Amino acid sequence: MPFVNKQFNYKDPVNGVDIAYIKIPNAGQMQPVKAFKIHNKIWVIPERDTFTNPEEGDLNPPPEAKQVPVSYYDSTYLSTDNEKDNYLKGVTKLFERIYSTDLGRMLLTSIVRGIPFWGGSTIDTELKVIDTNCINVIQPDGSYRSEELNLVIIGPSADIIQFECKSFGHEVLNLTRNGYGSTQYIRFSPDFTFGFEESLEVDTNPLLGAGKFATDPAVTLAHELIHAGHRLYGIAINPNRVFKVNTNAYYEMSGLEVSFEELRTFGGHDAKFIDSLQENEFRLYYYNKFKDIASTLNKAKSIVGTTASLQYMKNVFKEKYLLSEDTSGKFSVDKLKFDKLYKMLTEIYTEDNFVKFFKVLNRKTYLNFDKAVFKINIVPKVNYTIYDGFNLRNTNLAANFNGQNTEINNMNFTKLKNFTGLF
């Protein structure tokens, strides 16, 4: 029943199957890193991410006079085995908390079924996997074997609080926006969280609030997983498509723009900032993309490799994209089924909806201003649980989101930096 059927310890010996030294397809080179496969298609790498981006391999904090507003540096974070063990257990617990909700189960299921499309070959009559959607796992005999995967959770790069969903691009194909999908690497940490304010007028003001309430890290991870969902099904919205915020004087005076992809991901009222016309434009766009994939699958009859058969992969993508098949054997995209899947990934899986399922206090909108960053430790059950997060039932932290109240549950939060006034 649990999402992660094993209680991994960082020091558990490698077995070359689900505990192994691996290398990622970053085009650059690296020494193997110890990784853990926590569920089918999902791996966790308890290391700071100095791999997906060759230029971002320096964790050292730049000169103090060169740092920005919302940012936090600590070159030493996640450098010891104890931290890595705690990181692994923290991420595992968050997957369990997410999976414990019907919405989370639905999202995680969609992610596991969202295998990146096999479209790296030139012969349209040949299905081949794109190697950047794989990792190289060191087998017991010391040899490398390629394994496809959908998701990897890795530690943050230099700026510890810059969580994000990233993936390797293609020379020509826009994998996250052409329906194909690509392996998603989420830079994330269960060891820190952010403070927000309970009053909307204060939370959306850059000069007020110290961050009384702490964001539940399960929501933060879910937010990234929602992005991963969009990207795995190749329906993410181009980052250049943004909303020139005209509903917040502080954003306005600074010309701040928020991508539609973020508004979509948050959901709730934020999603409404994307008008119908442009919304229909995107939907039709991805519908065509799914159609192209449907035809590529029709022309495709031969396959590369021998790990899986053609009849298997064709069905794999028929299942992923929920396509239809006629008497002959030709696939087509069903109007109704496409809209249902598209809507599930973009409107059902949202941050706002996860807040409803977790019963936690959270920012009411994406268009706000961070107040602070806190150090936390969600591994001990006396601190945080799969079922209640910080708001432990049958304790003084059970009601009124007392567990998330950093003033009441002060022992669970260490403020590392204040952001208010720095904007």
């Binding site: 969903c165 952010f194 937010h223 994406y366 706000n368 201003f369 961070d370 904007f423």
Partner: peptide, 4 residues
């Protein structure tokens, strides 16, 4: 991404 968390954003501002």
């Amino acid at each position: 991404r968390r954003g501002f």
